[PDB]
């Protein structure tokens, strides 16, 4: 069972605020599909709730939602009460949010990280990216320009 994490962060490490992602990067959707299509995607229940009803579940992937709530209904997803329960297919991508990235990092051998060149200083209640330690290796891709007006770039990090 391989596990990867995929996220986008501002240079501050902020990934979420007010139940949403505080930028848009339409051009990076193809990369997100490329990585995740045909695989299991795992997300925390706050990330599931952040997806509009019309976009969820994400098509072409097995959607799994992590919650402690016995009852919890996430229609079009399988709800599980632990991360280890999700991790049963050959390839699983954790697609957010902050709590779940922190839970899943020990299990991961890939992180696909888009860095957005925005000064987005941290504020109370923000969701933050996990911190990568020295075990991680990988390169910094070249800058790309979004029509949203922001530069962004892709880190493909991996470890054994
Ligand atoms: N790339 C990006 O920039 C991304 C940003 N985001 C953003 O991240 C934010 C959401 O992140 P965050 O608030 O950290 O929430 P999460 O999406 O990580 O969801 C947290 C919920 O997951 C469940 N959960 C957490 N830990 C466990 C556990 N150990 N066992 C079982 N269930 C667990 C809980 O559900 P419950 O309360 O039901 O028990 C918890 O409340 C939003 O702003 C979202 O837009 C999301 C995805 C990508």
Swiss-Prot record:
CDD domains: DHFR. Keywords: NADP, One-carbon metabolism, Oxidoreductase. Substrate binds at residues 6-8, 28, 33, 61, 101, 114. It is an enzyme of class 1 (oxidoreductase). GO terms for molecular function: dihydrofolate reductase activity; NADP binding. It catalyses: (6S)-5,6,7,8-tetrahydrofolate + NADP(+) = 7,8-dihydrofolate + NADPH + H(+). NADP(+) binds at residues 7-8, 15-20, 44-47, 66-69, 81, 95-100. The keyword Oxidoreductase applies. Pathway: Cofactor biosynthesis; tetrahydrofolate biosynthesis; 5,6,7,8-tetrahydrofolate from 7,8-dihydrofolate: step 1/1. GO terms for biological process: dihydrofolate metabolic process; folic acid metabolic process; one-carbon metabolic process; tetrahydrofolate biosynthetic process. GO terms for cellular component: cytosol. Signal peptide: none annotated. It comes from the Bacteria. Pfam families: DHFR_1. Belongs to the dihydrofolate reductase family. This is Dihydrofolate reductase. The gene is folA.
